[PDB]
Design a protein around this nucleic acid. Structure first.
Lengths: 108, 228, 335, 335
DNA sequence: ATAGCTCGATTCGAGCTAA
DNA sequence: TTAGCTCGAATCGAGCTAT
């Protein structure tokens, strides 16, 4: 539960930067998560990107973050073979549940 | 001030001085023999036991690296599957008959290496204990990586007596074993005054060399070699 | 005491090239050398939400909102020209030999024992029955995986190159040769004995395999699929990309060799579904259910270890399968 | 008492260049100076579980779950064009000489005696047997490591480039001069004194070696492989990486020079394997073992001290091994 | 515990004989 | 391999010191 706060605290300090930092040209800029990384780009683009956050309601960034944290767990076959990875997946499912819950009602 | 000698390490000061800020200052240089590890500018108000504490962390990191990179090879005793490690022993040298092996069911006990291309040998418990007795590694066997191979050899014709600096690796207050000269002399059954002649440096009057039997028995008693 | 090596890597035998794709008309196949290559094109698509929901998305308030903004994708496709109805593929296949010799080994006594084990097999049973089923997989266009599932007529041409010029030409018809029956034929035995010549190391074998399939006027062909890094936008996701070597849709070489390996029939489960590829633990990616389980001790490793270490020779019928995996090679031998 | 030197760093002789690979068709190798280079491209693969399991993953539920979660990785692949069947590899080889002189040596007494020992060897016999076996490895496509195991016709052309121009040309058949025996040939002996003059130090010598091989149309070529830092995603794992200099697949210089080093037939073990490279302790990477172990006293280091310190020279075939390792170069002495 | 000294007695190596 | 023997040189113990 402490991981998603500092993840949100990370997105807190991206809100203080330039409104259109992610709108610059670039070959690789992680546009899949750009709907949540830059909330202030909706003010610059009234219809080009404001409705993109409204229409899509990005919640798969948490799925991308879930794949990242899967690299942060110990790669032990004993945990996967036994039920140790079961409740670890149960706590992974629930902790990403209210984490993703914040992102959909960000437009309010 | 004075050059602080901590076992094989020697913190020598700069002959000239400097005034960083307004206070007097000197450059203290840590040495591992002919190897220079650090220069640290320190005041003249510090005592020797405080410059020693200032340079202690680099020495501790050096000792950690030396213990890790010269750790003896570990052998593993496993069942007829190779998944469960029943017993592990650190060895100074591998068994003579090791070949690339994957455990099977026809033998109950297998002696595999800890390296991922696991060499192995089918053994029983009695032969495993014979190999463990013959091949075991002493607790301070990592100090042999910091010593030349011609001072650790058991062949008397190819053996060279260790120098004073190579002797400071295993005996002394700031040595890698931590035993004093009096304790080392008591382990060799000789007087401390004669061992101080072994550990004497730069004093050409009355400086002696250790013998083959004394050196190897000392390495036996300190836990560095020949303690299988 | 002899034991298996820690590393037992084998090189791959019967290595095929990358099968190109060119399009043309039927009965023009005798002059299909300069046929135009199949080029991958681009289509922008959208799709309604059709995947199975998780019982929490089934509310009509948000299910109707799901189809308000359906996902947009940009898919790569491979289609024939309008004035073309025949798909032509071409690749070369070599037969190397030396199945029992590993590229890398650890135990010298185990390597010698494995060589003696495969030496007794060759004299007792030559590289013939495996070579026959390798000829059938060359005969029918199984390497056209889904490019022949509804094809009216498929013809396969197999040539033999010695000094840059064709020596013996083999022509088969794939519709007559089923994917489930491994029969006997005089033309296939001529091909099979050539495979046996390469497998035994007698001589060099280089086969140019050209297959023609009748699909339709301007339909879609199905080449190998690549991977997408997915770093773009959510509208131009580029969810599909097809294999192409030089502006020409093609098939992976391991895709061709996968179908050429589909000779394993003898797995202890029921064989009504058909043959499978010779692999350790007898697995195909289509069903996700592996035959030859280690619990039933009919896998590669249990059969290989018993036949070499314990000298437990199995029947003649499964030892065709342990050598077959030595043909494809592998990285056999764990820590 | 003539103790050995603590540092004995030796410069390496027979320095090869990177072997650039370009492609084309046979019978055009006389004008092969504009052949298109073998390009490095990317393809995606997937595989099944073909490795041994640690007695716990052999459960049918766990094994099938691994098949349901496939390992998708991309690999580096190099292939010939579909209209090209000839692979040429071009590297330059320069012979230096002065093999007895070390770059670093502490004891001046040891350097004088070592130079005296090398000079005593040269007067008894020159670098003739050494260069004969070196030219034999140049005669065959041994440096064309895995592209020769299935070559139908492989041919080399060696040119003596003295003043930037062909002073003397050579043309050999690599399949005829096999990688098993070192016989005698008049044209091979003509090459022998060219390297022998370079090894002796009479004058500057530089060679260019181009090896054409009949591979096949679109077949898989094998350049030298690279290391992967293993930082990206598991789907884009890049499990294989090949060596290229400028959009052209190439072979490492030390990979080429290792094959030219393969002249050691004098190791005490049985000759079922054949010649190996001349490096101390006789290490064979593929077999994971070491011929000329120090226990039976036939490695480089014990022979060197016997020859130099206590003056007991080894056998004449063992003296070839010592000088070949001296030509090979290394960081000798107590490091 | 470090560092080093002197002084007379004991040990030590490499010659040698003696068998 | 046993069984010794000189002869100068290095080592050994036990006295003292110094830091």
């Amino acid at each position: 539960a402490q991981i998603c706060d500092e993840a949100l605290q990370y997105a807190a300090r991206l809100r203080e930067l330039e409104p259109g930092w992610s709108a610059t040209p670039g070959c690789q800029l992680h546009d899949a998560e750009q709907l949540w990384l830059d909330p202030l780009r909706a003010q610059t683009d009234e219809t080009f990107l404001q409705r993109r956050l409204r229409g899509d309601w990005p919640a798969e960034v948490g799925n991308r973050f879930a794949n990242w944290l899967n690299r942060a767990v110990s790669s032990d076959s004993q945990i996967l073979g036994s039920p140790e990875a079961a409740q670890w997946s149960q706590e992974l499912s629930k902790e990403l549940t209210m984490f993703k819950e914040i992102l959909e009602d960000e437009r309010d | 001030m004075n050059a602080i000698h901590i076992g094989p390490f020697s913190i020598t000061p700069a002959a000239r001085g400097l005034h960083y800020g307004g206070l007097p200052h000197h450059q203290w240089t840590l040495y591992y023999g002919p190897r220079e590890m650090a220069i640290k500018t320190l005041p003249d108000s510090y005592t020797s036991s405080e410059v020693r504490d200032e340079f202690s962390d680099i020495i501790a990191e050096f000792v950690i690296d030396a213990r890790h990179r010269y750790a003896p090879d570990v052998l593993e005793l496993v069942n007829s599957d190779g998944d469960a490690v029943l017993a592990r022993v650190a060895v100074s040298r591998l068994p003579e008959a090791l070949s690339g092996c994957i455990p099977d069911d026809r033998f109950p006990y297998w002696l595999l290496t800890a390296s991922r291309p696991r060499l192995g040998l089918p053994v029983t418990l009695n032969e495993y204990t014979a190999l463990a007795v013959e091949l075991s590694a002493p607790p301070l066997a990592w100090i042999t990586g910091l010593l030349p191979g011609e001072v650790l050899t058991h062949d008397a014709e190819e053996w060279r007596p260790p120098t004073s600096w190579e002797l400071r690796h295993v005996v002394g207050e700031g040595s890698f074993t931590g035993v004093s000269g009096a304790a080392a002399a008591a382990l060799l059954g000789m007087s401390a005054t004669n061992f101080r002649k072994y550990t004497a440096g730069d004093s050409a009057a009355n400086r002696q060399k250790i013998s083959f039997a004394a050196w190897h028995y000392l390495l036996d008693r300190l836990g560095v070699k020949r303690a299988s | 005491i002899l034991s298996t090596a820690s590393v037992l890597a084998f090189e791959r035998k019967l290595d095929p090239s990358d099968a190109l794709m060119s399009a043309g008309a039927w009965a023009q196949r005798d002059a299909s050398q300069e046929w135009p290559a199949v080029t991958v094109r681009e289509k922008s698509v959208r799709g309604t939400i059709s995947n199975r929901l998780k019982t929490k998305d089934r509310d009509p308030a948000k299910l109707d909102a799901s189809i308000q903004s359906p996902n947009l994708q940009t898919v790569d496709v491979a289609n024939l020209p309008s004035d073309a109805d025949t798909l032509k593929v071409r690749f070369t296949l070599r037969v190397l030999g030396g199945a029992g010799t590993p590229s890398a080994c650890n135990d010298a006594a185990y390597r010698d024992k494995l060589l003696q084990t495969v030496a007794t097999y060759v004299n007792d049973q030559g590289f013939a029955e495996l070579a026959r089923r390798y000829a059938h997989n060359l005969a029918n266009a199984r390497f056209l995986w889904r490019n022949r599932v509804g094809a009216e007529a498929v013809e396969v041409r197999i040539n033999h190159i010695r000094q840059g010029e064709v020596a013996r030409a083999w022509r088969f018809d794939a519709l007559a040769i089923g994917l489930r029956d491994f029969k006997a034929d005089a033309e296939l035995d001529a091909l099979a004995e050539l495979i046996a010549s390469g497998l035994s190391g007698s001589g060099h074998v280089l086969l140019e395999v050209v297959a023609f399939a009748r699909i339709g006027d301007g339909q879609e062909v199905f080449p190998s699929q690549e991977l997408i890094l997915d770093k773009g936008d959510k509208k131009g996701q580029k969810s599909k990309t097809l294999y192409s070597v030089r502006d020409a849709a093609a098939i992976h070489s391991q895709k061709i060799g996968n179908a050429l390996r589909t000779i394993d029939t003898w797995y202890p489960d029921e064989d009504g579904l058909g043959p499978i590829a010779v692999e350790p633990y007898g697995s195909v990616t289509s069903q996700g259910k592996a035959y030859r389980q280690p619990k039933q001790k009919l896998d590669f490793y249990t059969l290989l270890d018993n036949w070499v270490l314990r000298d437990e020779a199995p029947a003649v019928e499964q030892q065709h399968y342990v050598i077959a995996n030595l043909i494809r090679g592998g990285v056999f031998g764990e820590a």
